């Protein structure tokens, strides 16, 4: 019983899941950290490593790896929702609101190993690693991301 066998089993049949559903799905992966080890990639295009490992018409699974003191952009997920589980380490998740053309910081909290973060539709966040060790997380997006939008901090 390995990671893809696990994904087809849990995610492969969801139709129109909620961020509720996705969070629960993630927590249903046994030994998720160990399972995804072969799919952890290193920073290529981004400050952070990013590997897409599953996609159907409903969702998209991504493995993310944020080095010490690195961060994502400030982004929304277009028409998609999202949920992520922390496999290893600890991220800081910061929430923003549209300051019009820009965005200002609205809220910030930590997600620890095995814990989940959620992104309701339209939500704008940045993920960062304020720690000295790396952070590996597993993201689901539904539907798959097409129209991501990056904001400049105000
Ligand atoms: Fe995101």
Swiss-Prot record:
Keywords, alphabetical: Dioxygenase, Iron, Metal-binding, Oxidoreductase
Variation of activity with pH: Optimum pH is 6.2.
Gene3D superfamilies to which the protein is assigned, alphabetical: Jelly Rolls
Reaction catalyzed: L-cysteine + O2 = 3-sulfino-L-alanine + H(+)
Keyword Oxidoreductase assigned: yes
Top-level EC class as recorded in UniProt: oxidoreductase
Ligand binding (Fe cation): 75, 77, 125
InterPro entries linked: CDO_1 (IPR010300), RmlC-like_jellyroll (IPR014710), RmlC_Cupin_sf (IPR011051)
E.C. code: 1.13.11.20
Disulfide topology: none
Gene Ontology MF annotations: cysteine dioxygenase activity; ferrous iron binding; oxidoreductase activity, acting on single donors with incorporation of molecular oxygen, incorporation of two atoms of oxygen
SUPFAM superfamilies from the UniProt entry: RmlC-like cupins (SSF51182)
Cofactors named for this entry: Fe cation
Annotated cofactor note: Binds 1 Fe cation per subunit.
Protein family (similarity comment): Belongs to the cysteine dioxygenase family.
Something else known: Although there are Cys and Trp residues in equivalent positions with the residues forming a thioether cross-link in the eukaryotic homologous sequences, no thioether cross-link is formed in this protein.
Name under which the protein is recorded: Cysteine dioxygenase
Organism encoding this protein: Bacillus subtilis (strain 168)
Gene: cdoA
